[PDB]
Amino acid sequence: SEVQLVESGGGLVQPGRSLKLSCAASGFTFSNYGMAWVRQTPTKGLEWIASISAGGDKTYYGDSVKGRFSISRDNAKTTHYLQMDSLRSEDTATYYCAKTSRVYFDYWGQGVMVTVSSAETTAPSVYPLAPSMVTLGCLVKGYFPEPVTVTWNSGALSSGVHTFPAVLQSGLYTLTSSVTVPSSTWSSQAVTCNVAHPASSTKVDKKIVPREC
Amino acid sequence: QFVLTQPNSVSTNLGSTVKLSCKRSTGNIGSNYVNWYQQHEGRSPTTMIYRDDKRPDGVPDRFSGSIDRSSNSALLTINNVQTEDEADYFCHSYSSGIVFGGGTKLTVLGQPKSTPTLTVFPPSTEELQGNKATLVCLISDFYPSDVEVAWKANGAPISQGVDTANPTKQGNKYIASSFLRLTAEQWRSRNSFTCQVTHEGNTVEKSLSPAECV
Amino acid sequence: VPKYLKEPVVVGYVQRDSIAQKIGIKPGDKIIKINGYEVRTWEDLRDALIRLSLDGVKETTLFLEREGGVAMPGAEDDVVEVLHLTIKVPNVQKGEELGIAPLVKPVVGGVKKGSPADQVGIKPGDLILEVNGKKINTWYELVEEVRKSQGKAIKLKILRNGKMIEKELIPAKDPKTGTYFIGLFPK
């Protein structure tokens, strides 16, 4: 399939404030299909939020929405939107945009995290981890909120990449990502982890150098 | 106007046949199409079955949808349940609104047991400049998921500043991580630090030594 | 000429282990094109499949529509689900078929004299509703369970001028041919 749905506009918001999500679509005739937004929490599961028709003239909303959210769409820019006002802490979820095919959602986006909290966003501190076969690492320490992404050599090193789920301690998250490469790759070329924290618009690069004293 | 009830969890073995049930509370289940979505851990849902029993391209023949108006229940059937089918399955329907089932966590048993592999990391020089030290212990390549994690200082147990993540499924097997928070003074003060994992009788361990350089 | 040949190609039954089943064609699908040949009636599809096979075509396109049922909120304005498939053309020289059947109501047109059918009393003009408990909507659905049951009793449900009657039959093999048969003429 060529259908692509890419969310953006998420992150952290204080309670009672506003946030507008975007979903850029490509690979299909956008105006020929209705769009929708579905959110997910580990406790409540999948819950339909809003739905808009192909032409953008009819709108439908879930029960948890009571005039707060306004789903719109721009059939000229192949993008639909979810304007959210008066956000409560219970609105914290992963928000998916979805495409419809008459009677179901045929394709889902990647989902964007929205955290409603009075706590401030904290960019992570990244530290290089160093010790045939060599396993290097990167410590992503003390960020909020989730998530962070880690690539190695801007994505060129994809084999043997393990990004471990974070731990939560005193309101801050910490995880470690590791990669296993032949020592020839470590000696000939630099090995760098690329950390991204979208909620704080942060990107960090840290080169892995052998241990010192 | 109505809800869809699925079992919270279902356990089956490799090669077996599982029946994931989706019950419509009020109304006829045949009056609106039932759709099934698979969601792996940390991934987006994908369509397995739409329009009661239509299977999209790329979905294996092992999946099949059905409708039983007698019990007013929709059933997703997976023949020859493989390890990749371990995921969440949500049924879906509609009427005046759009309703999702609660979801069923499908667990596939029977895969071979694997002992954990450990990787430890000393605190970086950059972190030591801040007078803080974090010891990292990575646990990977183990099945089943249940593991116990403990730390030791010069062979003596230590149990403060320890943070351990729950085991998650990453591909074929499980992975987990554990952290030990210390000050830069505490790190250089001791001769050895050990991460210890207990998995089904076994007790694997790896050590960290600050006396690397003279 | 049967009545269905002038009707749009709405699949009423898909034969198991056939080309249409392997590719995923389902009952309710509407075939609208094959290479190319526009398909508006069952006659077009039959003539196209013959011409294609005679021209040696082994693979070609098949355009299909999948609609029906109540629309889900927000998706009522969607365009029609048109599927683009690559199909294996059946070899008509060897008698191969595509594997789809039209939605013709299983109304018996005749019963053979002496065959264990008038045994339990099925008459010409009857309408088959359910067999073995399962509902069916076409004739070819009954013929599938006859040569799969392997002799055991098949409980049939029949409507006649308003009344619903239940009949049960058991017969099996045949000497001249060598297959399980009952003795019914469709209409």
Q: Which residue of B31, B55, B97 is in closest CB contact with C73?
A: B97
The DSSP element (H or E) to which C186 belongs, if any, is strand C184-186
Assigned token pair, C171: 């017969």
> Which chain B residue shows the shortest CA-CA distance from C72?
B94
Query: Does domain A4-116 sit in CATH 2.30.33.40?
Result: no
Architecture of domain B111-214: Sandwich (2.60)
Q: Return d(Cα B139, Cα B184) in angstroms, integer.
A: 24
Strands (E) in chain B, as ranges, are: 4-5, 9-13, 18-24, 35-39, 46-49, 63-68, 73-78, 88-94, 98-100, 104-109, 117-121, 132-142, 148-153, 156-158, 162-164, 168-170, 173-183, 193-199, 202-208
Token pair, residue B12, equals 């089956």
Distances (CA, A) of A103 to A30, A56, A78, C80, C172: 17, 17, 21, 11, 44
Element (H, E) at C125: none
Cβ-Cβ contacts under 8 Å between A and B: the total is 117
| In chain A, where the domains are located | 4-116, 125-207
In 3D, which of A200, A198, A207 has the Cα closest to residue A6? A198
| Chain B residues touching A169 at Cβ < 8 A | 163
- Three-state DSSP at C29 gives coil
Q: C: neighbours with 3+ CB pairs under 8 Å?
A: A, B
Single-letter amino acid code for the residue at B99:
V
In chain A, which residues have their Cβ closer than 8 Å to the Cβ of C81?
101-102
Residue C146: count other Cβ atoms within 10 Å of its Cβ: 18
Of the candidates A48, A125, A133, A107, the residue with the CA atom closest to the CA atom of residue A82: A48
Question: Nearest to residue B167, comparing CAs of B104, B120, B116?
Answer: B116
3-state SS of A2-39?
A: CCEEEEECCEEECCCCCEEEEEEEECCCHHHCCEEEEE
d(CA C140, CA C138): 6
Q: Is C74's CB within 8 Å of A58's CB?
A: yes
Tell which residue, A29, A5, A33, A34, has the closest CA to residue A96: A5
Q: Is A106 exposed, middle or buried (0-12, 13-18, 19+ CB in 10 A)?
A: buried
Query: Nearest by CB to B96, which of C66, C68, C73?
Result: C73
Residue A40: count other Cβ atoms within 10 Å of its Cβ: 21
Domain boundaries, chain B: 2-110, 111-214
CB-CB contact of C83 with B56 (8 Å): no
User: Do A33 and C79 make contact, defined as CB atoms within 8 angstroms?
Assistant: yes
Contacts of A73 in chain C (CB under 8 A): none
E strand map for A42-171: 45-52, 59-61, 69-74, 79-84, 93-100, 105-108, 112-116, 125-129, 133-143, 149-152, 161-163, 167-169
Q: Tell the burial category of A49 from Cβ atoms under 10 Å away from its Cβ (0-12, 13-18, 19+).
A: buried
Distance in angstroms (rounded) separating the CA atoms of residues A96 and B45: 9
Q: How many CA atoms lie within 13 A of C143 on its CB side?
A: 15
Cβ-Cβ contacts under 8 Å, B119 against chain A: 135, 137, 178
CA–CA dist C106, C98 (Å, integer) = 21
How many Å apart are CA A160 and CA A164, to the nearest integer? 12
B189 in Cβ contact with B154 (< 8 Å): no
Q: B96: distance to nearest CA of chain C, Å?
A: 7
In terms of Cα–Cα distance, which of B172, B104, B105 is closest to B144? B172
Quote the CA–CA distance of A99 and A57 in Å, as a whole number: 16
Regarding beta strands B9-13 and B104-109, do their DSSP bridges make them parallel or antiparallel, or are they unpaired? Answer: parallel
Q: Does B2 touch chain A (CB under 8 A)?
A: no
Burial B178-195 (b: 16+ CB within 10 A, else e): bbbbbebebbeebeebbb
Residue in A22, A75, A71 with CA at minimum distance from that of residue A51: A71
Query: Are A196 and A149 in contact, with CB atoms under 8 Å apart?
Result: yes
Mutate to test the interface with A, among C26, C70, C78 (most CBs of A within 10 A): C78
Q: How far apart are CA C148 and CA C16, in angstroms?
A: 12
| Method by which this entry was solved | X-ray
Is the CB of C75 inside 8 Å of chain A's CB atoms? yes
- Whether residue C74 and residue A53 make contact (CB cut-off 8 A), yes or no, is yes
Q: Is C47 helix (H, G, I), strand (E, B) or coil?
A: helix
Q: Which of C23, C66, C72 to mutate to test the interface with B (most CBs of B within 10 A)?
A: C72
C-alpha to C-alpha distance for C29 and B175, rounded to whole angstroms: 46
Q: For residue C10, give the nearest of C24, C34, C26 by alpha carbon.
A: C26
Question: What is the Cα–Cα distance from C108 to C93, expressed in whole angstroms?
Answer: 30
Rounded to whole angstroms, how far apart are CA atoms C120 and C160?
15
Which residues on C lie below 8 Å from A35 (Cβ)?
Answer: 74
| Residue A54 contacts C where some CB pair is shorter than 8 Å | yes
Closest partner CB to C26 (pick from B33, B54, B96): B54
Homologous superfamily of domain range A125-207: Immunoglobulins (2.60.40.10)
Whole-number Cα distances in Å, B111 to B2, B146, B202, B209, C144: 39, 15, 18, 36, 39
Q: What's the CATH number for B2-110?
A: 2.60.40.10
**Is the CB of C69 less than 8 angstroms away from the CB of B55?**
no
Cα–Cα separations (whole angstroms), residue C165 to B154, C122, C156, C168: 87, 10, 9, 10
CA distances from A118 to A13, A88, A205, B111, C24 (A): 7, 11, 29, 45, 52
Q: Are B19 and B11 in contact (CB under 8 A)?
A: no
Give the pairing type, strands B173-183 and B162-164: antiparallel
Torsion on CA atoms C130, C136, C140, C145, rounded to nearest 10? -60
- Tell me the CB-side half-sphere exposure of residue A97, using CA atoms within 13 A: 30
DSSP B122-182: PPPHHHHTTTEEEEEEEEEEEBSS--EEEEEETTEEE-SSEEEPPPEEETTEEEEEEEEEE
CB A123 within 8 A of CB A143: yes
Burial class (CB in 10 A: 0-12, 13-18, 19+), A104: buried
Rounded CA gap, C116 and B96, in Å? 52
- Asked whether the beta carbons of C112 and C122 are under 8 A apart, the reply is no
- A104 at interface of C, judged by CB pairs closer than 8 A: yes
- Please enumerate in sequence order all residues whose Cβ is within 8 A of that of A171, keeping only pairs 6 or more positions apart, or say none: A119, A144
Name A147's Cβ contacts closer than 8 Å, sequence gap at least 6.
A113, A198
B55 reaches A (C-beta below 8 A): no
B32 vs C contacts (CB less than 8 Å): 69-70, 72
- CB proximity under 8 Å: A 102-141 to B: 103-111, 125, 127-131, 135, 137, 139, 141
Q: Do A174 and B102 touch (CB under 8 A)?
A: no
Whether the CB-CB separation of C78 and A104 falls below 8 Å is answered with: no
Between A and C, how many residue pairs show a Cβ–Cβ distance under 8 A? 52
Q: How far apart are CA B2 and CA A107, in angstroms?
A: 24
Could you tell me the two tokens for C25?
Answer: 């064609």
Q: Quick one: closest CA in A to C74, which residue? A: A53
B94 min Cα distance to partner chain C (Å): 6
Q: How far apart are the first and last CA of chain A?
A: 53
For residue C68, which residues of chain B lie inside 8 Å, CB to CB? 51
Tell me whether B170 touches chain A (CB under 8 Å).
yes
A79 DSSP β-pair partners: A24, A74
The alpha carbon of residue B120 and the mean position of all alpha carbons in its chain are separated, in whole angstroms, by 22
What are the beta bridge partners of residue B173?
B170
Query: Is residue A33 packed enough to be buried (19+ CB in 10 Å), middle (13-18) or exposed (0-12)?
Result: buried
Strands A112-116 and A11-13: parallel
Distant-in-sequence, close-in-space partners of C157: CB < 8 Å, separation ≥ 6: C128, C129, C130, C131, C164, C165, C166
Helix (H) or strand (E) holding A156: none
Question: Which amino acid appears at position C7 of this protein?
Answer: E
Amino acid at B160: Q
The two domains A4-116 and A125-207 share their CATH topology (first three levels equal): yes
Measured CA to CA, the distance from residue A20 to residue A81 in angstroms comes to: 7
Q: What is the resolution of this structure in A?
A: 2.2
Count CB neighbours of C78 within 10 A: 21
| β-pairing verdict for C13-14 and C100-101 | antiparallel
Residue whose entry in the numeric block shows the structure tokens 């019950």:
B23
**CA–CA distance from B175 to each of A158, B121, B172, C34 (Å)?**
17, 16, 10, 51
Chain C residue nearest residue A60, CA to CA: C74
Mutate to test the interface with C, among A28, A102, A105, A107 (most CBs of C within 10 A): A102
Q: Do B94 and C24 touch (CB under 8 A)?
A: no
Cβ-defined contact of C70 to B55 (cutoff 8 Å): no
Phi/psi region, residue C46 (left: phi>0; alpha: psi -120 to 50; beta: rest), is alpha
A13 in Cβ contact with A116 (< 8 Å): yes
Question: Which chain C residues are closer than 8 Å to B97 by Cβ?
Answer: 73
C146: tokens are 């006859």
Residue C112, SS3 per DSSP:
coil
**CA distances in angstroms from A198 to A24, A114, A150, A204, listed in the order given:** 17, 11, 12, 11
**Contact between C129 and C161 (Cβ < 8 Å):** no
